[PDB]
Write an enzyme that holds these catalytic residues in place. Structure first.
Site, PDB file in Angstrom:
ATOM      1  N   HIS B 120       2.310  10.354   4.275  1.00 49.61           N
ATOM      2  CA  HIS B 120       3.514  11.105   4.691  1.00 49.61           C
ATOM      3  C   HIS B 120       3.062  12.454   5.257  1.00 49.61           C
ATOM      4  CE1 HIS B 120       7.389  13.113   4.583  1.00 49.61           C
ATOM      5  NE2 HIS B 120       7.809  11.914   4.989  1.00 49.61           N
ATOM      6  N   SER B 323       7.155  -4.947  -0.762  1.00 48.27           N
ATOM      7  CA  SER B 323       7.765  -4.009   0.223  1.00 48.27           C
ATOM      8  C   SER B 323       9.188  -4.453   0.574  1.00 48.27           C
ATOM      9  CB  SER B 323       6.950  -3.886   1.470  1.00 48.27           C
ATOM     10  OG  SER B 323       7.501  -2.911   2.340  1.00 48.27           O
TER      11      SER B 323
END
Lengths: 373, 373
Positions: B120, B323
């Site tokens: 990130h 996921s």
């Protein structure tokens, strides 16, 4: 399954405890007279001001338009042209003070950061966090920085780029570090104004000095580089927020371009509160310049009332110029505990926040105080 | 004077825009199915969790009792005994990831911090902030860290105390850095587990892996030092908040004792949101272990549905194990803009958050996608 019973009870217990203690506050600076009723309903939405409000977010639920108008209210209130200003609504004074110290650290990587003994504990956190070089400075007895000791230490250190942490409204004594004095004294050491930083920590007094007759140096006209205010402290807010206002020229300069990964905005956080910007927008738009001034004259007078009634009696109480923090010698274990007075070294204090429409809660104090004398 | 008319209009306009766009989200991870109606009324109060919740605050209006119970829910959910855990409800994943990296930096002052290319952008901010030594590591194509390149670089650097930033649920590809693999490979370099740090960034997947059959390594049993979760991402919250959970032994060790001024608590902030801890307490107590699992099985299945319907057609879409981020090649300027898809290099993605009770919004996507093929 919705909430159990024991859990629903705990929550409802808690509500009653808050009703009980809503206007408890006499010793801390957090003003409890706000109406954000009209905003309760926006808790329905997942609002996220992740990113800079000046740029745009594909994340559609954001108060950026309201954050923009809060930043233009403060730009103007701290006397910098909005076009020349950058800043945002933070999660508190601390994030506002960290951003400013970050700004200074990046401009003057070698700069020692200077801060008085009457500085908020939050600066200790900041200094460790930002791995920044720090020099403690003595305090004058009213809470101001020992200006003389600042300059003495700036010279011994042989510092060419001091980062000045200026306490604009000390937590304990309500002191104000005179940034105009500082600037002159550091000018007199033959240091150019361009070659050093001044951050105003104004958690409380940033919403006092602008509505006072003779304000000390604090704003961008007065020559600071960045200011931090606490939304929840003086304006009053259910959620702690902050406003930080810096110079765009400075903010822009410190490019956040890392090893491959590019922080797309000049913010310290990722996803940001989008509700608090509304809350700040309401407060700032629901009060005229004159409405805040009224609120602060009443706060100031009351703080005078309290010095008076105490000075008449034995008690050597005082209040710095424009302060709403009345300092006196700390009484019994009863008094401070039974009014939640912040006590720090032979001294207590009350803050005449404006959730006191009346001195009733304050005379309630002075009575339990004169009773020791 | 209360709000003007043009101002009251702007606010009411905005409410309609939020109603319009309430469930807009298909491309970002922020889940928009929460009911914190019961909490709207607590916006009346000036609540402040300034300080550690384990200690006490003379500031009476605080949700510390509710923060305590959230920290005991996560302690147990991440398989560390609560007595042995420290952490708090932060202002987001970023503050949670900054706290962890702070913890590592203090334990291993010289340690290089290692992070993949699929990390990130928030880590870029953190690394500048904490003036910490950083080494970028390559990514495998599914978004995982090139484990082999990590170890290669740990050796070239001759690093004895690596700080491993582990992406537990990559933003773009939904990847999970296998912390058990990492530990073994760094064990195999002859580095003791005591002499290096592993922080889990789990913004999203920290509320996925615990309700999955075969979870990857992420928790304290799995041998991490600290984890960060985003409240607003998966559980859903109107205000961005975070949970950070660390080892008390580590937290306690790094004494915040500065030049005279003593940060009285182990928190990064000053005054903290007291409303978000309630919000997190409600979500965690209003859902059984089984209720969350249901929510995530539905999210996982739907993400399978989307790979399927796309795989049947020409499109090479995929989803990492556990996921809810379906990656496919990025289509026209129409599609991504007209669904607010996060697009980053020849690839788009959707996240099957659980504000989709139904694939209706998702089939709406795949239809506008197969229409290019």
């Amino acid at each position: 399954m919705t909430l159990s019973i024991e859990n629903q009870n705990k929550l409802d217990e808690f509500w009653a405890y808050c009703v009980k203690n809503q206007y408890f506050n006499i010793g801390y600076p957090e003003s409890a007279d706000f109406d954000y009723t009209i905003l309760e309903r926006f808790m329905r939405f997942s609002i996220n001001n992740c990113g800079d409000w000046a740029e745009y977010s594909n994340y559609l639920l954001n108060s950026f338009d309201f954050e923009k108008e809060v930043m233009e209210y403060f730009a103007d209130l701290f006397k910098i042209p909005f076009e020349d200003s950058w800043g945002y609504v933070t999660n508190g004074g601390t994030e506002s003070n960290m951003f400013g110290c970050y700004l200074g650290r990046e401009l003057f990587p070698d700069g020692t950061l200077y801060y008085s003994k009457d500085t908020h504990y939050s600066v200790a956190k900041i200094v460790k966090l930002l791995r920044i070089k720090s020099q403690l400075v003595d305090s004058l007895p009213n809470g101001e920085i020992d200006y003389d000791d600042l300059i003495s230490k700036i010279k011994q250190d042989d510092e060419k780029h001091p980062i000045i942490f200026a306490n604009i409204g000390t937590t304990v004594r309500g002191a104000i570090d005179d940034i105009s004095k500082i600037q002159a004294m550091i000018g007199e050491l033959g240091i150019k104004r361009e070659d050093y930083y001044i951050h105003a920590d104004a958690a409380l007094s940033g919403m006092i000095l602008p509505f006072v007759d003779e304000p000390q140096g604090f704003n961008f006209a007065d020559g600071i580089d960045s200011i931090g205010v606490s939304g929840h402290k003086m304006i009053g807010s259910p959620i702690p927020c902050g406003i930080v206002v810096a110079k765009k020229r400075n903010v822009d300069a410190i490019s956040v371009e890392i090893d491959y990964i590019s922080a797309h905005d000049k913010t310290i956080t990722g996803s940001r509160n989008g509700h608090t910007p509304l809350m700040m927008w309401c407060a700032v738009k629901s009060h005229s310049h004159a409405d805040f001034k009224r609120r602060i004259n009443r706060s100031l007078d009351l703080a005078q009332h309290a010095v008076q009634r105490l000075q008449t009696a034995g008690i050597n109480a005082w209040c710095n110029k424009n302060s709403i923090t009345v300092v006196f010698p700390c009484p019994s274990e009863a008094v401070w505990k039974k009014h939640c007075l912040a006590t720090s070294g032979g001294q207590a204090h009350l803050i005449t926040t404006a959730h006191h429409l009346d001195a009733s809660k304050v005379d309630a104090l002075i009575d339990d105080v004169i009773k020791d004398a």
